[PDB]
Chain length 314, copies 3
């Protein structure tokens, strides 16, 4: 890495060291080659496309390469970031806008669902509270796949739509806001939750089963009213309680000093556009992105990070 990180590997791998180490170091020396080569192809395919564009007459197919690029960056991202990131919990909620905000929440949930099916990920709905119009008042689900969290972490934040409400006939543009919170699933062996700290409750499913778990120390509360049995429900409430717990703990250990708009992205239907505001990137393939083709935007985010965040000059 740099050649500096690859220097230690040049020497370490020298004639001496222990078996448990030669594999340890050699294995990483290879990890660096992939990285080295992957960025190689990235940079080649990049410099390549810039020729297909202004070759006196662009060859409308820099899209075959443009796509591969989005692909090379998610691979690089995977090799770079210290590894445990394949399981994630997603929660989406309406924001400002009323009936319209819950409708956008479903639009998002629809994007992610269709995204999952395209990356070959597995998705399970932990819970969903719909709205008469066909919106969502709350939804939390689990996504697992090669780098699911590593990629979805980019979706955390406030999303806003700009569009004329569908049941509104030719009315005025409406701006609503939805919240997406992504967290990494925390296995049982990775965090301690004492029995006496937990308070479990169950009730008739207000008008299949309804459960609620309270982590007394924290005060975190997990409530589920779905089709799983009480027993099964409890296990699902716990998967979520851990992630929510671990986070709150992370938070309680960093936010005691950290002491709004924060719109992370905007979708505009009349313009059929998507603008992620951390990178100031705009795309005009809104419907295809909302249809589940989110790589173009995430890969851009991944690049910006690998170009001037942690893994760059570090």
């Amino acid at each position: 890495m740099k050649e500096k990180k690859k220097e230690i590997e040049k020497l370490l791998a020298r004639p001496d060291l222990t078996p448990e180490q030669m594999k340890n170091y050699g294995m990483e020396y290879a990890k660096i080659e992939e990285i080295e080569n992957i960025t190689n192809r990235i940079k080649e395919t990049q410099e390549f496309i810039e020729l297909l564009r202004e070759e006196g007459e662009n060859e409308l197919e820099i899209e075959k390469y443009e796509k591969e690029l989005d692909q090379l960056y998610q691979e690089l991202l995977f090799l770079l970031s210290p590894e445990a990131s394949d399981k994630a919990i997603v929660e989406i909620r309406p924001g400002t806008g009323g009936e319209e905000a819950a409708l956008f929440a479903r639009d998002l949930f629809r994007m992610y669902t269709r995204y999952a099916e395209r990356k070959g990920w597995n998705l399970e709905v932990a819970e969903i509270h719909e709205t008469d119009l066909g919106g969502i008042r709350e939804v939390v689900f689990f996504v697992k796949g090669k780098n699911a969290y590593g990629i979805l972490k980019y979706e955390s934040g406030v999303h806003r739509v700009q569009r004329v409400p569908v049941t509104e006939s030719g009315g005025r543009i409406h701006t609503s806001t939805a919240t997406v919170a992504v967290l990494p699933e925390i296995e049982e062996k990775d965090i301690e939750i004492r029995p006496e700290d937990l308070k479990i409750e169950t009730f008739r499913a207000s008008g299949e089963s309804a459960v609620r778990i309270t982590h007394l120390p924290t005060g975190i509360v997990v409530s589920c009213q779905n089709e799983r049995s009480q027993y099964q429900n409890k296990q699902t409430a716990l998967r979520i309680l851990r992630a929510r717990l671990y986070q709150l703990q992370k938070e309680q250990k960093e936010r005691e000093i950290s002491q709004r708009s924060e719109k992370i992205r905007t979708y505009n239907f009349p313009q059929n556009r998507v603008t992620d505001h951390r990178i100031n990137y705009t795309s005009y393939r809104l419907q295809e992105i909302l249809d589940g083709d989110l790589d173009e935007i995430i890969s851009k985010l991944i690049e910006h990070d690998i170009e001037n965040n942690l893994e760059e000059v570090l």
Copy 2:
């Protein structure tokens, strides 16, 4: 053209006029010569085949030239109907037959699906209601391609199947019905639909996705026309789909409401008998013994025989 529609072209084309008229009339000048040539190729080729039948020992290969007759006639239709017949909306539902009827609906959907692919057109499924036996309760879909509407317009009507049902173990021959409705797509600039005349509702999908994902219903308050969708699309996308269908539907309903107000059933448009492997179209009484090939998508033989007749007497001809 004729010699007449070519007359006005002769004079108009004369010395002076306006630029925008030169290319204009000039462009219409060519239209007629090609029309004249194609009708010349058809005649030269038609009159050539009939000599290859009783020459003293036929040359079973008239089919090769026969296949070009189907193509020349469609090229002639494209030149005789220069308007805007490139976008169409198709709808297929079961007629009488029960399960068997919903199965024939699919056989047709497949046929048009593969027929589309062969003409290299673009097809998009608006919506589909399938049946357990792998059949179709209802299906609607758009098709855009070179004069793809002027070609699929002859498919509107009832289509009847004659055959032993697949699940019926070699038993008796059954006869079911399937209904095809082909409407030309209508643009927003060509028909007015006032905001206040539209009621749009949206509901939860009925039984990760839940049922399907989104449900939209659009009602044209005046006429009563209702367009309902339940499919993978989003609300925003189904509405634009529902609106595409509603324009086509309303434009059709107004044409009827203007004729059906001065013009005051069986209508078996065509037949698909499997035991005999034939397909007979009843408006032209043309028959083919290439059933499965036609069902597999090679439909041109029949539509051209329909165009030929159509042009052989209707508007295009004596008009």
Copy 3:
């Protein structure tokens, strides 16, 4: 035949007999002659190859005549065997070995695909369940050509492979298996199948048409799922069934008095060889064989048959 089967013909062709019998007995005589002439050509070109070997200096061409016998044997086989027609149904499926078995199953399907093209035969694939890596979970196809069934009837049995999986880089030699089943197609007139013994079902395509047919008494079941229409597929299923049924009968009336390993042939890649075990013959042109140049092996199997089977002392 012998001079015996011929004797009777000679006398039946004496002074009298009927028109329809005249031609009938007249053709089999000539048939017999052809058998005699070919059985002679075979015998001489043979006695001529041996001489070309230990003559005083082999003339490396005993192969041009070697290939001639490949032909003569098949023409003999034609003239001899039971009417064994020009139509055949072949089925191939993985044996033991996991993915590798599936991959070798397609290997075999390729050999035959290529072999049939060399024999000028026609070939329609009835169905094919494929594997991501490119193997074949299952396949049945139809073949038609001058006694394609007779010549292919010797492929029925378990085929075994020994090689390093292509996806393994310089690994250990893995060994697998693939089953091949050949059946002579039965025309509807030839076999009786009552309507009340079939159970024909249909379903929607999971993820064109789906069709399954069951022969209630036997338990035989043919599934179909492809681009075909329910109707075409049903007809494609009745062909395969009449074959599965007929055979099952020729069996159920022999597999009732005939009271595993049955490794029919072995293809070893490192040593580049094909070893047919029923005759213990080894060819060293494995690849040319897997490419469809099967006449070598089959003509050997044909020569053993005529030599010790019915067609001999009988």
